[PDB]
Design a protein around this motif. Structure first.
Motif, PDB file in Angstrom:
ATOM      1  N   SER A   1       0.849  -1.190   0.000  1.00 42.37           N
ATOM      2  CA  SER A   1       0.000   0.000   0.000  1.00 42.37           C
ATOM      3  C   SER A   1       0.883   1.239   0.000  1.00 42.37           C
ATOM      4  N   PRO A   2       1.376   1.668  -1.164  1.00 42.37           N
ATOM      5  CA  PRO A   2       2.226   2.870  -1.190  1.00 42.37           C
ATOM      6  C   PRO A   2       1.563   4.090  -0.574  1.00 42.37           C
ATOM      7  N   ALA A   3       0.280   4.320  -0.869  1.00 40.32           N
ATOM      8  CA  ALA A   3      -0.386   5.524  -0.385  1.00 40.32           C
ATOM      9  C   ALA A   3      -0.486   5.529   1.133  1.00 40.32           C
ATOM     10  N   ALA A   4      -0.702   4.360   1.737  1.00 40.89           N
ATOM     11  CA  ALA A   4      -0.797   4.288   3.190  1.00 40.89           C
ATOM     12  C   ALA A   4       0.517   4.701   3.847  1.00 40.89           C
ATOM     13  N   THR A   5       1.633   4.164   3.352  1.00 36.86           N
ATOM     14  CA  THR A   5       2.941   4.513   3.897  1.00 36.86           C
ATOM     15  C   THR A   5       3.287   5.980   3.644  1.00 36.86           C
ATOM     16  N   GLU A   6       3.020   6.483   2.434  1.00 34.11           N
ATOM     17  CA  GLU A   6       3.333   7.880   2.141  1.00 34.11           C
ATOM     18  C   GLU A   6       2.475   8.824   2.979  1.00 34.11           C
ATOM     19  N   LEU A   7       1.220   8.448   3.244  1.00 33.62           N
ATOM     20  CA  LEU A   7       0.373   9.303   4.064  1.00 33.62           C
ATOM     21  C   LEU A   7       0.807   9.253   5.522  1.00 33.62           C
ATOM     22  N   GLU A   8       1.242   8.083   6.000  1.00 36.73           N
ATOM     23  CA  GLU A   8       1.872   8.039   7.315  1.00 36.73           C
ATOM     24  C   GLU A   8       3.088   8.959   7.363  1.00 36.73           C
ATOM     25  N   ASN A   9       3.904   8.948   6.305  1.00 32.34           N
ATOM     26  CA  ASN A   9       5.061   9.839   6.229  1.00 32.34           C
ATOM     27  C   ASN A   9       4.645  11.297   6.397  1.00 32.34           C
ATOM     28  N   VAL A  10       3.678  11.751   5.594  1.00 28.80           N
ATOM     29  CA  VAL A  10       3.313  13.167   5.626  1.00 28.80           C
ATOM     30  C   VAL A  10       2.674  13.534   6.962  1.00 28.80           C
ATOM     31  N   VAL A  11       1.884  12.632   7.551  1.00 25.97           N
ATOM     32  CA  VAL A  11       1.255  12.949   8.833  1.00 25.97           C
ATOM     33  C   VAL A  11       2.308  13.046   9.933  1.00 25.97           C
ATOM     34  N   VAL A  12       3.280  12.130   9.923  1.00 27.33           N
ATOM     35  CA  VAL A  12       4.389  12.178  10.872  1.00 27.33           C
ATOM     36  C   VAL A  12       5.128  13.508  10.757  1.00 27.33           C
ATOM     37  N   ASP A  13       5.417  13.934   9.521  1.00 21.40           N
ATOM     38  CA  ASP A  13       6.152  15.183   9.325  1.00 21.40           C
ATOM     39  C   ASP A  13       5.313  16.391   9.723  1.00 21.40           C
ATOM     40  N   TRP A  14       4.017  16.354   9.403  1.00 21.67           N
ATOM     41  CA  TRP A  14       3.087  17.390   9.835  1.00 21.67           C
ATOM     42  C   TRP A  14       3.161  17.586  11.337  1.00 21.67           C
ATOM     43  N   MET A  15       2.978  16.502  12.092  1.00 22.57           N
ATOM     44  CA  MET A  15       3.008  16.605  13.547  1.00 22.57           C
ATOM     45  C   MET A  15       4.372  17.073  14.039  1.00 22.57           C
ATOM     46  N   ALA A  16       5.453  16.603  13.404  1.00 23.86           N
ATOM     47  CA  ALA A  16       6.792  17.017  13.815  1.00 23.86           C
ATOM     48  C   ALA A  16       6.960  18.527  13.711  1.00 23.86           C
ATOM     49  N   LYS A  17       6.432  19.127  12.646  1.00 27.43           N
ATOM     50  CA  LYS A  17       6.573  20.573  12.540  1.00 27.43           C
ATOM     51  C   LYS A  17       5.525  21.310  13.362  1.00 27.43           C
ATOM     52  N   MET A  18       4.397  20.666  13.655  1.00 21.81           N
ATOM     53  CA  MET A  18       3.456  21.244  14.607  1.00 21.81           C
ATOM     54  C   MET A  18       4.094  21.391  15.983  1.00 21.81           C
ATOM     55  N   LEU A  19       4.900  20.408  16.386  1.00 19.52           N
ATOM     56  CA  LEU A  19       5.624  20.492  17.650  1.00 19.52           C
ATOM     57  C   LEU A  19       6.926  21.282  17.541  1.00 19.52           C
ATOM     58  N   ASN A  20       7.341  21.652  16.328  1.00 20.79           N
ATOM     59  CA  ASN A  20       8.548  22.445  16.086  1.00 20.79           C
ATOM     60  C   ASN A  20       9.811  21.708  16.548  1.00 20.79           C
ATOM     61  N   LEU A  21       9.966  20.489  16.041  1.00 23.94           N
ATOM     62  CA  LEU A  21      11.177  19.714  16.246  1.00 23.94           C
ATOM     63  C   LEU A  21      12.252  20.144  15.250  1.00 23.94           C
ATOM     64  N   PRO A  22      13.513  19.807  15.511  1.00 19.15           N
ATOM     65  CA  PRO A  22      14.558  20.070  14.518  1.00 19.15           C
ATOM     66  C   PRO A  22      14.353  19.214  13.281  1.00 19.15           C
ATOM     67  N   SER A  23      14.978  19.652  12.183  1.00 15.29           N
ATOM     68  CA  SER A  23      14.845  18.938  10.917  1.00 15.29           C
ATOM     69  C   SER A  23      15.260  17.476  11.048  1.00 15.29           C
ATOM     70  N   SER A  24      16.172  17.175  11.976  1.00 16.83           N
ATOM     71  CA  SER A  24      16.716  15.826  12.110  1.00 16.83           C
ATOM     72  C   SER A  24      15.669  14.791  12.495  1.00 16.83           C
ATOM     73  N   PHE A  25      14.484  15.211  12.942  1.00 13.86           N
ATOM     74  CA  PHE A  25      13.401  14.286  13.255  1.00 13.86           C
ATOM     75  C   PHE A  25      12.412  14.109  12.111  1.00 13.86           C
ATOM     76  N   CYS A  26      12.509  14.929  11.066  1.00  9.64           N
ATOM     77  CA  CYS A  26      11.635  14.836   9.906  1.00  9.64           C
ATOM     78  C   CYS A  26      12.211  13.873   8.874  1.00  9.64           C
ATOM     79  N   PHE A  27      11.316  13.284   8.072  1.00  9.63           N
ATOM     80  CA  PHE A  27      11.755  12.436   6.965  1.00  9.63           C
ATOM     81  C   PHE A  27      12.618  13.213   5.985  1.00  9.63           C
TER      82      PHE A  27
END
Lengths: 467, 467
Positions: free
Chosen positions: A110-136
């Motif tokens: 399921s490529p779309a499932a994994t890619e959407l998990e990727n974008v949601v993870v990155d969304w939340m990471a920048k919502m919390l304002n983590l350093p770039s090193s925690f983003c994909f």
């Protein structure tokens, strides 16, 4: 026919209306029940039915036989433990996820499932304002889990295998983990799970002088004391918002300590982490650059229902290498092959409500807790045992206005009589000599009126016994 | 307002209609997609929205941007991996569970939830016709989990701690686990998780003479060979229906072997276990009295959607003692504190459909697989590599009617061209020298017509390359 579509849409409205009536009941329903063990067990048949039964008879059996024996977490009168933040978008996203029923253990399945998990993870990471090193997009990356213990187990395994690859394969009996005496029991549970010996899971005591924070000097002294004993420290867990008190550990100082000895630092975001989307609380995330891994529960404040737990790594290959047997395969990121499509539900909730609504919902809960704290502070009969940092107020009866020595047992009786009245449900912990009540604002249904009613009921119950 | 009830019922119908249209599409939709990595990642915004958006715009974005990049497990053309059996009752039970949003880690935090888990566990235990020792009313008892790896981890921890309590606390580096070379990789994953060393996770090879079953004599010889080396065997995993071939290990013989050395015997019910509600397959559960623990996935055949995994113990205190830190507290039965109310969904499915409908659904899938096997056997161009025991048929191109040496690579090309056509999705494994295709009947939507179409497409693709 198990997948009849017209019957599906017919019974879906029945279940949805059942849920809406349950929700509307909760303003009246006694939160915690008083029932006897075996009440449901004896009330139900001994074996499964041979034939089937209609949906509405099932739902009636539910509302009469199981609902009353439930603790109503969603009630606006529920302020114990930690909230199970539920919203329309979270419920409907659960429904949509289960309807798609796509199980994507790898990118190919399921490529779309994994890619959407990727974008949601990155969304939340920048919502919390983590350093770039925690983003994909910055080297590291994240993953959705079900609980904080899955994430904690994953980080513990990665840390243990990194240590053992450095010092030796047969040295597991010498690995030492450090956490505070306020750390959630899940840390000790997972440490025992991955083969760490009981003596090597060190809970370092915290002092009221330090607001019960894990002091980094005691950490360093414990580390070098165990290093002079010939053992290998490997893991340190700091916590943002502990369960009992809501303590925030000094993240950056412990980060420097863990860097100095090349220890794996994990941060249980837990309860406070979700609140860190707000600029006021983001400061509680400083030093996060020295951190090896961070976990946080979205179902504790981000309105996703249950369940969803983000986990971010600076070096995800340290995790993949521990559990494996470009394009992401989440089979190697967690415990099992079978995964759910939680990303679609988080995506649903976020795009439906907005970072704005999420921020202000957290802020409204925090404001209600501020007001509850202000109400407690105005009553000489009561006392804050620890200053509130989020939506958690810890209080107890004043010892000056209770008989000598029984302020704690009378606080416990106060909590017991309030909970038994059914009008509310508060938590309470016995910290050695003292007992105190936790009031957690977060049940979604809860408004200002409910906090006012709870405070008045606490006062009325206190006058009923105090003097 | 995050819990608006009229908006909830309004958008619920939107999502339900979305799901029903998705389901009705699946007869046409190409099962496995052909897309490029980054297709969705670049198509979505970089950060979360500040403001919200309507539900129908969200659902449109879903059906156009994520659905095509999905592998459609629910399609009637999907016969790879293992099914995610979905029904109306399972979906609506997911919705009801998430609507109640009751998180019951202990009996006190929701008595009805724990008691209903109890009755559902016992229901399933007698549906499979286990001895009384696995029922709550017979001494032992069970629990619902999310995956088989959670259950496997729990049993592994219990076994490891029993061994270590017998031989010594610091002897973990000497504990030896045994499984066959057909065992699911989750066993090795969990063994590595609980600190067992890589050399001590012994995969004993199986021979085509024994139908690739784990022969108990080789088990005994490995045990005494490692015992003469000064190591402590502690765990043996037998499997009912392996992933690649669907092998059933000789349960009773391995039970006597594990009893003789007082080893913990766990049975991965996995794929075949669910089918054992039928009297024809119940024989595959003999010797279950000598078994320490049994796990089985209901979402593989019992129509519960995802996810739900039963685990039964003869001595549950062996598990509680491993993870703890009358009335049942499921906090001590699994990995984490946070649990979902899966019991209500299993209860929903069972009482809505009936043991009758469940039995006959399993029997219909098995009959369709019987017919697929009969169709393969009538074609000299093909060959069964292993006789089918459930709804799993393993086949390949005949070597007599392909060029010398390239029957396996041509079988692989056959599978690749079929999957790429989009009209179906079959699995395939490379067992050393040979390659064979797995066809698994179980996608719920699948009827006789779909199996006929799949066989005709396999034949038409085979003639397109063979000679």
């Amino acid at each position: 026919n198990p997948m009849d579509l017209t019957e599906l849409s017919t019974e879906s409205k029945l279940v949805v209306d059942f849920i809406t009536q349950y929700y509307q009941t909760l303003e009246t329903r006694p939160v915690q029940p008083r029932v006897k063990p075996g009440f449901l067990t004896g009330q139900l048949p001994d074996k499964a039915p041979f034939h089937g039964e209609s949906m509405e008879v099932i739902l009636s059996d539910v509302n009469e036989k199981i609902v009353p024996g439930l603790t109503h977490w969603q009630s606006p009168n529920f302020h114990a433990y930690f909230p199970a933040s539920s919203s329309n978008a979270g419920l409907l996203g659960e429904l949509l996820c289960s309807g798609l029923s796509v199980i994507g253990f790898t990118w190919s399945s399921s490529p779309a499932a994994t890619e959407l998990e990727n974008v949601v993870v990155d969304w939340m990471a920048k919502m919390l304002n983590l350093p770039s090193s925690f983003c994909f997009s910055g080297g590291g990356g994240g993953v959705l889990q079900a609980n904080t213990c899955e994430a904690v187990l994953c980080t513990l395994a990665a840390a243990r295998d990194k240590a053992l690859n450095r010092v030796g394969d047969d040295q597991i009996n010498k690995l030492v983990l450090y956490c505070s005496d306020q750390t959630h029991f899940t840390i000790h549970k997972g440490a025992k799970l991955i083969g760490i010996r009981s003596k090597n899971i060190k809970s370092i005591t915290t002092k009221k002088e330090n607001e019960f924070k894990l002091c980094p000097n005691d950490l360093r002294d414990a580390i070098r004391s165990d290093l002079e004993a010939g053992l290998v420290p490997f893991y340190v867990c700091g916590t943002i918002g502990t369960t009992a008190l809501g303590v925030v550990d000094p993240i950056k100082e412990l980060g420097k300590v863990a860097r100095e000895f090349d220890l794996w630092l994990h941060v249980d975001g837990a309860y406070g982490g979700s609140a860190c989307i707000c600029p006021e609380f983001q400061h509680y995330l400083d030093g996060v650059d020295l951190v090896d891994s961070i976990s946080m529960n979205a179902h504790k404040w981000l309105l996703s229902n249950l369940d969803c737990c983000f986990l971010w790594l600076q070096s995800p290959n340290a995790l993949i290498e521990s559990l494996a047997a470009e394009m992401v395969d989440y089979k190697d990121w967690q415990i099992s092959l079978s995964r759910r499509f939680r990303a679609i539900k988080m995506w649903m909730v976020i795009r439906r409500y907005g970072v704005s609504n999420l921020i202000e919902h957290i802020r409204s809960d925090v404001s209600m807790a501020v007001r509850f704290e202000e109400m407690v502070a105005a009553d000489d009969r009561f006392e804050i045992v620890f200053p509130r940092k989020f939506a958690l107020v810890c209080f107890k009866l004043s010892s000056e206005k209770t008989p000598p020595g029984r302020d704690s047992e009378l606080t416990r009786e106060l909590m017991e009589r309030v909970n038994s009245s059914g009008k509310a449900y508060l938590s309470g912990v016995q910290m050695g000599r003292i007992f105190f009540i936790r009031c957690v604002i977060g049940s979604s249904l809860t408004e200002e009126r409910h906090v006012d009613n709870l405070w008045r009921l606490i006062q009325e119950t206190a006058q009923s016994i105090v003097s």
